[PDB]
């Protein structure tokens, strides 16, 4: 009986919920009530990257934390150097409609994609001296929202077709496919372990998938609207989710519950991007009200505001060494902050 | 200078890259952008042939004016997430099939195809991103309506309708109805044209429309406003 199946699903949902209720005696806020706060924190516009003429949609930091990659609708994927604001590379894209960009950990490759439904893998280091399309990965029936490199051969792509995928670059096929997420997946984040990753979708929920086995282990709810950005705590067992409801939700992987929400009555717009610091104390979220906000992770207090972008902040990143925080907004300027 | 030879040469490479970026930006600015939305089978493919994956891109030049037409019919995703990427287009082409008011949607007979057409139009015309962006709204299947009206009166789709079964009165009714969905009249405009397979001046209508939009945009920029 289909009604019996629905009833069983409801019973399982109740079992999950009361399991969380039993597994949560307390909340985060009371636990960290004695620690000293971060206090006021300010980051200046140390560098301003120019040359983009359309809205910036994505950014990614290189592993070394010197190079960075920026994507915009002008059809240009620009690889820049941070301290010396030079364009080490500028790649004309076939599809100007780009929403995702990725820097390979080895720095040899860079990923791009968008409404084209195709993930383009670009080989930077070649004898010819020109960046070329190393591979064109196809198969998602919707736009590619985000994509991160597992390594130089394996890449994860989340799409608006309600699916994530794990592709082998050299063969050009998708080895694994993560399905079961009702909405359009808008962001994914690999763990430092690089085998488990959390992906949030438009159905107001996130799922933690495993790369090897290929099945979701923990499904997290709590948001009132779409999820636009997701990121992992530097350790690995916690993850933060930026949503369209002006709240950033931090969860633990082991507890399977919502550890905290971040909101203040002033902010009403959605959260375009989310990020973390090196120690995990600071959570940086870019909003549509044109200013990045820095929250304290252990105390839901907002640590500060990075203002200076005249339009919607569309992407955030933190250098691997943790020294710099890069914000790329729709105003066609990326700013580095310290 | 306090910069090495290689540092200076890298700066020179960056200068070349900025020069090329400015050139490409000028080339893009010379170009006129159209976003084409067809509510189901609304003559999108036919008109696309006449003027000549997720997105289908076309480029054509008419009398020294360049046009990039973007079709998103195959996206089949939440439009709220990718409709803002087209903010800044010169115009939105919107295809509505007049023959569809007798026909019904594939998802049961509960909704008329015209009904879905007007909800989609009310969504896109009044969208926050397309606040000041003009719409060239093409009424397609004019011959099919002309041959087919006498069979089924328009009152079935519009119960408030009370008029003759001739083409002109019905077409005027629909055009007025669609122009009535415009919540905000002052900022934007709606250009209506009826097209068939035989006509060859539909793209001319597109050109006059975008010429009006270009003149309006510069009037805003040049100070005349």
């Amino acid at each position, epitope marked *: 009986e289909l009604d019996q199946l629905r009833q069983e699903a409801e019973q399982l949902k109740n079992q999950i919920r009361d399991a969380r209720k039993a597994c949560a005696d307390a909340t985060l806020s009371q636990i960290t009530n004695n620690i000293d706060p971060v206090g006021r924190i300010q980051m200046r516009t140390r560098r301003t990257l120019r040359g983009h003429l359309a809205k910036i949609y994505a950014m990614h930091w290189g592993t070394d934390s*010197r*190079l960075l990659v920026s994507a915009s609708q002008d059809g240009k994927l620009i690889i820049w*150097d941070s301290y*010396t604001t*030079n364009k*080490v*590379h500028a790649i004309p894209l076939r599809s100007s409609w780009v929403m995702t960009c990725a820097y390979a950990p080895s*720095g040899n490759y860079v990923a791009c994609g968008g409404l084209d439904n195709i993930c383009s893998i670009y080989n930077l*280091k070649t*004898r*010819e*001296g*020109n960046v070329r399309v190393s591979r064109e990965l196809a198969g998602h029936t919707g736009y590619l929202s985000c994509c991160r490199f597992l390594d130089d051969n394996q890449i994860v792509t989340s799409s608006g077709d309600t699916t994530c995928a794990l592709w082998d670059i050299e063969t050009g096929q998708q080895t694994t496919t993560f399905t079961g997420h009702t909405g359009d997946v808008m962001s994914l984040s690999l763990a430092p372990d690089t085998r488990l990753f959390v992906s949030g979708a438009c159905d107001a929920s996130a799922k933690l998938w495993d790369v090897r086995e290929g099945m979701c282990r923990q499904t997290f709810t709590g948001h009132e609207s779409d999820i636009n950005a997701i990121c992992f705590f530097p350790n690995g067992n916690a993850f933060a989710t930026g949503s369209d409801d002006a709240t950033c939700r931090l969860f633990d992987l082991r507890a399977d519950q919502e550890l905290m929400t971040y909101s203040h009555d002033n902010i009403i717009c959605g959260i375009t991007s989310v990020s973390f610091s090196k120690s995990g104390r600071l959570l940086l979220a870019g909003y549509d009200d044109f200013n990045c906000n820095v929250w304290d992770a252990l105390k839901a207090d907002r640590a500060g505001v990075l203002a200076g972008h005249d339009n919607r902040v569309s992407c955030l990143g933190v250098t691997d060494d943790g020294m710099a925080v890069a914000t790329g907004s729709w105003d066609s300027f990326l700013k580095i902050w310290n | 200078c*306090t*910069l*090495s*030879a*290689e*540092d200076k*040469a*890298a700066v*020179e*490479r960056s*200068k*070349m890259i900025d020069r090329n970026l400015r050139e490409d930006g000028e080339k893009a600015a010379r170009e006129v952008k159209l976003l084409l939305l067809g509510a189901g089978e609304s003559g999108k493919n036919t008109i696309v042939k006449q003027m000549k994956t997720g997105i289908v891109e076309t480029h054509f030049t008419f009398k020294d004016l360049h046009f990039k037409m973007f079709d998103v019919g195959a996206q089949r995703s939440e439009r709220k997430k990718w409709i803002h990427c087209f903010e800044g287009v010169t115009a939105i082409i919107f295809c509505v099939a007049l023959s569809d008011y007798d026909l019904v949607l594939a998802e049961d007979e509960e909704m008329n195809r015209m009904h879905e057409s007007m909800k989609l139009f009310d969504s896109i015309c009044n969208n926050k991103w397309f606040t000041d962006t003009s719409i060239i709204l093409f009424l397609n299947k004019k011959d099919l309506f002309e041959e087919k009206i006498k069979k089924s009166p328009l009152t079935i789709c519009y119960p408030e309708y009370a008029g003759s079964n001739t083409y002109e009165e019905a077409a005027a009714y629909i055009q007025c109805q669609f122009e009535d969905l415009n919540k905000r009249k002052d900022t934007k405009e709606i250009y209506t044209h009826f097209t068939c397979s035989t006509d060859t001046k539909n793209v001319q209508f597109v050109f006059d429309a975008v010429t009006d939009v270009i003149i309006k945009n510069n009037l805003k920029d040049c100070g005349l406003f």
Partner: single-chain antibody
Amino acid sequence: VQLVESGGGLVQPGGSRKLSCSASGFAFSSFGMHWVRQAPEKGLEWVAYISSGSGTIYYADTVKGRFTISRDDPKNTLFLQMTSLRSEDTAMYYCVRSIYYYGSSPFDFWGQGTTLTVSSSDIVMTQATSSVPVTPGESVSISCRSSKSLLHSNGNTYLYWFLQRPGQSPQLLIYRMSNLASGVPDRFSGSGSGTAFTLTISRLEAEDVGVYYCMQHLEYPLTFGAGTKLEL
């Protein structure tokens, strides 16, 4: 990737002539170019350099004004115009390519070579050894000493190591004292302290037999090492 350079031959003294260098297999527009000549019995010496887009056209001090160099980007060619040759100009001219950005490998590819015969405050480079016996499979350290500190405040020291097999073009080994050239075995490594820099060969092979040269890339007039030759 090829660098074919044509011309050469015997020229009467005081003559004027154009050396040619035709490039293929890479974006000639994006790569700056160099002409670097070698005397019949002496080491390499820099001659000319032209940047991408012809922004800079530099020549060595001893040869300024007399020499010119231009590029044809549509046809992917490099030309070196030559005036009033002397006996000092009898040499083997090599066509070299370079590119300049963070992480790039300048002087990575070298040309085959052209022969030219003529009838009758710069940084000092010292390769004090100039002759070392080598036994295959044993680590050799070849040290090149510069006059002034090759370190720069940016965090880079600019030394380049080149290997020349006999009857063959020079090949890049190490750039910036510590970055291994792509396509070169790991047996070679580099290490330096800002005034003297050593190339270390772990296990010698037949391919390792040749002459080694050290370049500095701080001041624009490029200076070359005398050449440490390997004798087995």
